[PDB]
A paper describes a structure:
We examined three globular proteins from three phylogenetically disparate sources including: FtsZ, the cell division protein from B. subtilis; NS5B, the RNA-dependent RNA polymerase from Hepatitis C Virus; and P38α, a human protein kinase. Based on this analysis we defined a truncated form of B. subtilis FtsZ spanning residues Ala12-Ile316 (termed "FtsZ truncated").
Based on the quality of crystal morphology and initial diffraction screening experiments, we focused on a single condition (30% PEG-200, 100 mM MES pH 6.0, 5% PEG-3000) and harvested crystals that diffracted X-rays to 2.45Å resolution. FtsZ formed orthorhombic crystals and contained two molecules in the asymmetric unit related by a non-crystallographic 2-fold axis. Non-bonded contacts at the NCS dimer interface are formed between the backbone oxygen of Lys 64 and the side chain of Asn 74 as well as Glu 76 and Glu 84. The structure was traced from Ala 12 to Phe 315 of FtsZ for both subunits. Although guanosine diphosphate (GDP) was not added during the purification or crystallization, analysis of the nucleotide binding pocket following refinement revealed prominent difference density consistent with the presence of GDP.
Numbering used by the authors: 12 to 316
Write the structure that this text describes.
């Protein structure tokens, strides 16, 4: 009932902006940064500047230790801001300073308060270099000590989904959108009950990550749109391990007012059949008027090990 999405650092705050622009519902947004100037560019209702003393608003200089210590200075304000949450999503681009460093501390504060804590983060594009990958690897492992499940999106695989010619700015804009899909794919099912009923317990069921959780997405229009979206999702480059390996699968089928009963059963079957015969599968369905001929299938896969 109280669901918070907390964007952490530049990339995380940009994802939260995307979510706000797509008018994702049922969540309260918090933006967090060590850089006061970038924080001023956030559309989140709540704008939290961490490490005022340590950084004087000037950011974390790509250093995870400064992000970590900024969040420790601001420990009590983060506690305050997260008070009363049943569920907390922590999004960030891993590899920089504020995200890598502060997102785990924020995740752990969420968890200590009793919130169901899901992380949705990206691993950096190879083209950002070896130093970024290494800092990201470090933050990813810290993060999964601090959350109930960590969805890790490998940015390289986005290049296999967007066109050959894509400058950086645009590549990073599609990373905002995959982050948004990871959060929304879950939150949409929980914010409002749904025609398929789906409570917190259903979600806690699959919310058990040792191992990085992975996500697949599939979009389609036309007359076989259901099977084509389902198939694309279980086939997404973002899903770096076959879905048949996962202990847990959450499926979200989203469409417009003409999403059909037969399509929901079709997609549910395609995804279930590609999965292990002993899988714990929970799924839901949501209507989004803004979609017309388009359906979106999202699969979140957990418990690979
Ligand atoms: N989703 C998204 N990711 C970004 C963006 N810019 C950079 N990144 C990624 O996020 C990582 C950290 O960047 P940034 O968030 O600016 O660092 P931070 O503010 O110190 O946490 C980078 O290594 C990139 O892979 C962006 O605008 N959107």
């Amino acid at each position: 009932a109280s669901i918070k999405v907390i964007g952490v650092g530049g990339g995380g705050n940009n994802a939260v902006n995307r979510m706000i622009e797509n008018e994702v519902q049922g969540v309260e947004y918090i933006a967090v940064n060590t850089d006061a100037q970038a924080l001023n560019l956030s559309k989140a209702e709540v704008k939290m500047q961490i490490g005022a003393k340590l950084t004087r608003g000037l950011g974390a200089g790509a250093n995870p230790e400064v992000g970590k210590k900024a969040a420790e200075e601001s420990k009590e304000q983060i506690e305050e801001a997260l008070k009363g949450a049943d569920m907390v999503f922590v999004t960030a681009g891993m590899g920089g300073g504020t995200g890598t460093g502060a997102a785990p501390v924020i995740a752990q504060i969420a968890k200590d308060l009793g919130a169901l804590t899901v992380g949705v983060v990206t691993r950096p594009f190879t083209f950002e270099g070896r130093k970024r990958q290494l800092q990201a690897a470090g933050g990813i492992s810290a993060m999964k000590e601090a959350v109930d499940t960590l969805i890790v999106i490998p940015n390289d695989r986005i290049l296999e989904i967007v066109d050959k010619n894509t400058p950086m700015l645009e590549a990073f804009r599609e990373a905002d959108n995959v982050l948004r899909q990871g959060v929304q794919g879950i939150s949409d099912l929980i914010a409002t009950p749904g025609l398929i009923n789906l409570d917190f317990a259903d979600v806690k069921t699959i919310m058990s990550n040792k191992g990085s959780a992975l996500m697949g997405i599939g979009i389609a229009t036309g007359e076989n749109r259901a099977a084509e979206a389902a198939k694309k999702a279980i086939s997404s480059p973002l899903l770096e391990a076959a879905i048949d390996g996962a202990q847990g699968v959450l499926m979200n089928i989203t469409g417009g007012t003409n999403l059909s009963l037969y399509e929901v059963q079709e997609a549910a079957d395609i995804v279930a059949s590609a999965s292990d015969q002993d899988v714990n599968m929970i799924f839901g369905s949501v209507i989004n008027e803004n979609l017309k001929d388009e359906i979106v299938v999202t699969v979140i896969a957990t418990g690979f090990l």
